[PDB]
From a paper:
In order to elucidate the carbohydrate-binding specificity of LPyV in a controlled setting, we recombinantly expressed VP1 pentamers that are unable to assemble into capsids due to truncations of 27 and 66 residues at the N- and C-termini, respectively. The LPyV VP1 structure contains one bound Ca2+ ion per chain that is coordinated by the carboxylate group of E46 and the carbonyl group of S214cw as well as several water molecules. In addition, the carboxylate group of E217cw is close enough to the Ca2+ to engage in an ionic interaction. These residues are highly conserved among all polyomaviruses and form one of the two calcium binding sites in the SV40 virion that are important for capsid stability and regulating assembly. While the Ca2+ ions in our structures likely come from the crystallization solution containing 0.2 M calcium chloride, they nevertheless demonstrate that unassembled VP1 pentamers can weakly bind Ca2+ ions. In order to determine whether conformational changes occur in the protein during ligand binding, we compared the complex structures with the unliganded LPyV VP1 structure. In all chains in which the tip of the BC2cw-loop and adjacent residues are not engaged in crystal contacts, the structures are very similar, indicating that the binding site does not undergo a permanent induced fit movement. In two chains, however, a crystal contact perturbed the native structure of the BC2cw-loop, but not the ligand-bound one. Thus, complex formation might stabilize the receptor binding site, and there might be some flexibility in the unbound structure that allows ligand entry into the site. This hypothesis is supported by the B-factors of receptor-binding residues, which are elevated in the unbound structure compared with the complexes.
Author numbering:
A (entry chain A), E (entry chain E): 25 to 301
B (entry chain B), C (entry chain C): 25 to 300
D (entry chain D): 25 to 299
Write the structure that this text describes.
């Protein structure tokens, strides 16, 4: 016999330089307050009278969700040659409540006749998430520049037909939860150096939604130079939109259905040359 | 000539540190007892009168399957510095009876007219499995908070419109076979550190189902720290739901159709620092 | 100025320890004899009167194909400590006649109206192959236990509603070509240690079929322990089912359409501890 | 400072042992001659009267394309113990004219009504290519053995119901351009040792076609023994069929639409023991 | 304790040998001028009277976009045995405005009835981009040689039924923005040695569009010999076409919808044996 190693499993505290945060963001489909009957859905989609006259009603436009996570304070002040910053290195994220769509008894349009189950959520889907050290930078682009957007959303200022394409003046920050419509704003690829975003769109009138879920998948956030998002002011920005599709009522009115998203982000303390004047 | 090695194939009894279990879980679509005529299917889906009035009939709601496999006993003493635990390291799993869907003679809605084959199982599908060292932890979220769930399923306590999104109070453990509805409960990603789960959903009214089967594929259960699920009290929890779609009757009533799932899990004995 | 190697291409005969076999399996959709007008298709699918009364006509049920290939004999003496066995290490396989589906002039239902081409083969597809050193082990599972299967197919003995799920009593060996219905039998994932199988299913009433073909792809048959199927009694079992979809007649009666599959298997001699 | 390497870009001519060939093959959908109005398409698909009476009209059947590329001559006398042969080692291939399908103004069946765009090419698609050192070897298999094929195509000799499955007597070589129907002939997997073929099929009546194009992709032609097709008689065989779908006319008659394929093949000289 | 390395994050200059450019190209669907109401869309697609009489209206034909980016001047003149050239080595590219398609209120054809949402953009899609050191080389091929193309597009000269297949005389350079119709011209695979192009097509009358967006993906532009496009005259050519599908009006007339594309290209200075006579 001899002395040798055996690997024992035990609870390990990570080093002090590493932290994990967890958060969930509830959808902002238009009914955005938990007490509302249609929480998690938009109001009925009202369609344009004409191109000239297209006025979506209040709460009919799905908007991005965003949360700002306050991270542990790293610096006494900002006066040294270097400072400490949290660097986001990886994320596990999941759309929660996918199985809620496996429901054919909810009141709606019938698949066949009134003896059958009801048509489930389907049609256009849009799933995106972002993790950044500052607000996600947005580019404005719309289907129609003559749409009149309601007061409670942030739309493009002085919208003109050029906004049906890319006008570099149409830019915003995703700095408010449930205020920036998905149909008006998309991530700005000419910026976002300090954010990672990922998105998937499938269109079509009645297309079946497709979603996966697992707790086994991690997305590494390091860029091509091996650096993750660096959290300015010790703030982590989590952004998403998860439009599952539309639910159709028996009367054939339709409402958008959104689902919440969970994030679990690992961050590490980094020494960084002081970027603050 | 010289002495050399030649590899002879033989039945190897694995080292005592390793074990394998096999199990199958029958679906729990609502007719959950093998003596029932519609075993493997739900009863006819009854749809809501109104949002205010939505009362699914008993046995119309597909539920998760769960089995608890008792593993060989490891510790006759639970008071030492360390104890032994089974660590689940990999799994092979397969949906069984996929070929049973390849059937156009079963009575139902006709594809074209009364001379044609009948519409096979189609529509929404949902396939998930979990392997864990304790019950799968669940998060409640429903399409409508005003549904009244029957007393033979576990649903969200004190359900309110907030349950149409994520309310962190709506939590449960998958600790009962065939009692937790799929449409109410999903895996809770904020917990489940000691479980691995995998799921795939495709919706739509009439979507063709798509399924693969092979005995060549293994999923490794080790997490990012190289550790698999650790089986508390020497119990392995296997969970799943395999909704293949709906079958439509000639009358156009529809029933969910589920399929069984087979698991083959490899585990190894680990020395673990005692939690007590 | 120097002696050096140059690679010359020549016909190389493999080492004695390696052999290759080629085979093809014709489809067994119901018309299973090449003299039959509808060879390679089933007869018209007849649908159930009711759940209680579901009697598929003879030759309306697609069945698995199987071929047993005799390999060179290895052991004249079966009494030593070890014996030799053929180990299947890789397979190249192809569904043949895919291009025969690229045909819109064949009589049937019209795509648009009587001036258009005819609806091609489409709907439910099922493609599987297995390579093993013994018959593929099957599990019985049906869509309906009240179906009465005809006497020219092997069905589940003493069928009960429990056979709509997984009943471990409902087991068989794929040991007859064109007799085991696809809709009754699937590979048994709890056995088949000595076989590798691979299957793909897409359902739906009218789904477009999708198929690839190439002679550039090989599948390795080695399991997790680096061991391929071992051919008991020097017999190699090839199994498959390749249902391309259904053809629809102008009358709207429907028939299954199957395609042949080709196999090319490489095997190597192994020394194996003598079981008997 | 020190002597060191710096990489300068310049035109490099490959070694004498390596050569590249380019070719394109136009589709043979039935209208196979460039001066014909429907060049690149079949004639209207005429459907069977009955299973017994199924006679496709002339030029309604898409056929494989094949080109023989004559490579530089390698051997003076074929009586040496070894000879030289060209070995095809890689290919870049592309379906050309994919963008021609992005056309909703072409006359035809309307998507919604007479104010809308016209239904584009869709339905059954079939894309294959082969690169080999001899003709592609074909297996016959048909949907129906009682079809009567036209005189201008090569069909299965003495067709029988057995030809609805695999009959090993039904074999042919793809040695004539626009003569071997796709619906009769497929690559024979039991042969073709000296060829590489690749195919993709999607069926269905009205299925959307899906196609990719890029100049960044190369397929290596070496087999599991590290050897590519060897060009017998210094001849390279290029084969394909690229059926994009069917076009539907206002009258609802339908025609197959094919697209051309480009090939770029790299070959190297090899010393080969004389057959 | 000992002297050891610690990795500090800072803004790094990047060598003088490397440069990055960014650009966006707006779609050229037919309404190509920002002031036009239907900017970003074609005019209504008018269909042929017959095969012999097929005359698409002005501005109904989507065309390729192209931009020429002027890079930093590298050489005093072209008189030396070797010159410096920019070599494009990688690109990040994104279709901008994908989220704008997540809009069911825009006027149009109804999904179910006048109470429901409107049918979103769907049907034929075509997405391609190219990065090159000279104009993309094009091959002409049409669905019908008897179509009459408008004066304001570059069509195949002396079109004949042979142009329904590949005729080697039907060749062009993509050297004008919004002039070369997608349905006439495709990348010429027999040339384009000095360009990298990538394309995806999905046809069908009503097919749901599918698009991804992320800022985490880079395409390497080096060929099989390890060489990227070399920029002749210090000009980088960016080409694309991004047809999202068609929008259908209530009247059932249809228009093509295109979306802008962003490019971020990384280039390096190379010594090149002088190719200019
Ligand atoms: Ca920038
Ligand atoms: Ca947690
Ligand atoms: Ca077993
Ligand atoms: Ca052979
Ligand atoms: Ca060339």
């Amino acid at each position: 016999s001899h002395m040798g190693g055996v690997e024992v499993l035990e609870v390990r505290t990570g080093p002090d330089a590493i932290t994990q945060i967890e958060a969930y963001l509830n959808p902002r489909m238009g009914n955005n307050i938990p007490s509302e009957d249609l929480y998690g859905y938009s109001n009925s989609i009202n369609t344009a009278f004409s191109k000239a006259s297209d006025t979506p009603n209040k709460d009919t436009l799905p908007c991005y969700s965003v949360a700002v996570i306050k991270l542990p304070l790293l610096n006494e002040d900002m006066t040294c040659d270097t400072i400490l910053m949290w660097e986001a290195v990886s994320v596990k994220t999941e759309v929660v409540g996918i199985s809620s769509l496996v429901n054919l008894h909810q009141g709606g349009k019938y698949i066949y006749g009134s003896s059958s189950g009801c048509v489930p959520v389907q049609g256009t889907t849009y799933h995106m998430f972002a993790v950044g050290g500052e607000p996600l930078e947005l580019q404005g682009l719309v289907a129609s520049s003559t749409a009149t957007y309601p007061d409670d959303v942030v739309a493009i200022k002085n919208m003109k037909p050029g906004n049906q394409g890319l006008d570099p003046k149409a830019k915003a920050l995703l700095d408010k939860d449930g205020k920036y419509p998905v149909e008006v704003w998309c991530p700005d690829p000419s910026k976002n150096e300090n954010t990672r975003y990922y998105g998937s769109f499938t269109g079509g009138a009645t297309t079946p939604p497709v979603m996966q879920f697992t707790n086994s998948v991690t997305t590494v956030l390091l860029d091509e130079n091996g650096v993750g998002p660096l959290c300015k002011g010790d703030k982590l920005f989590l952004s998403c939109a998860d439009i599952a599709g539309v639910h159709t009522n028996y009367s054939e009115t339709q409402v958008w259905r959104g689902l919440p998203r969970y994030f679990n982000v690992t961050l590490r303390k980094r020494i960084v040359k002081n970027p603050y004047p």
